[model samples]
Target: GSHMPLEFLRNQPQFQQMRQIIQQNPSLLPALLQQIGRENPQLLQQISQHQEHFIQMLNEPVQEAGGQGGGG
Candidate 1:
């Protein structure tokens, strides 16, 4: 199962608009999250959880970066 935050990146109209804006300047994720949080406090929890998950994944060593013998 993938733990990546795909909900915010999904193909909804609002997401599409945000994606276009963010693509031009990639540093807007935090600001965008903050703006969204003002409307939906639950989203702040989701943002925190996703950030923690991403950092944890980055901290873990890659068992197999190449196409090597590993699980299916």
Candidate 2:
């Protein structure tokens, strides 16, 4: 209930472009992390460990709970 993957809706280029734009902005990292946490509670631990990986995968950064609290 605390973690969820970011649900990417609409497979359109607009969405892709928006995602890319968001990723490019480092300031949006924390917000993205919060979103993930809200979506998938099961992957919290993994998200914590591979935060950078998570960011790379989703094209954004993730804030670690200091204990790798996010895992899949």
Candidate 3:
């Protein structure tokens, strides 16, 4: 379960600040996406999906698991 690089940063303090600005701009994180793209392309995929969760990681104490639900 230690494969995600973004998840790694998710716990970091620096990018955790980046996580804040991202809350105001959804497309901004993708800019950093350019960085991840070069470092670990596969991780980019994970970051791609976690883009929303990425913010949530710092957004609300990071959910334990089973965070998806919408009863509409």
Top candidate by lDDT: 3
Q: Whole-model lDDT for model 1 versus the true structure? A: 0.56
How accurate locally, in lDDT, is each candidate? 0.56, 0.54, 0.60
RMSD of each: 8.0, 12.4, 7.8
The residue-level lDDT of candidate 3 at 23 comes to 64
The TM-score between candidate 2 and the true structure equals 0.42
lDDT of 2 by residue, 1-72 (tens): 225343433243443554565767768767655665686645555567666555655663333355366564
Q: Which residue pairs show collisions in model 1?
A: none
Comparing 1 and 3 on lDDT, the stronger one: 3
Better of 1 and 3 by TM-score: 1
Task: State how far residue 11 of model 3 sits from its true place (Å).
Answer: 3.9
Clashes of each: 0, 15, 0
- Model 2 residue 35 CA deviation (Å) reads 0.6
lDDT for 39 (candidate 3): 70
Ranked by lDDT, the better of candidates 1 and 2 is 1
Model 2 Cα shift for residue 57 (angstroms) = 2.8
Write down the lDDT that model 2 would get.
0.54
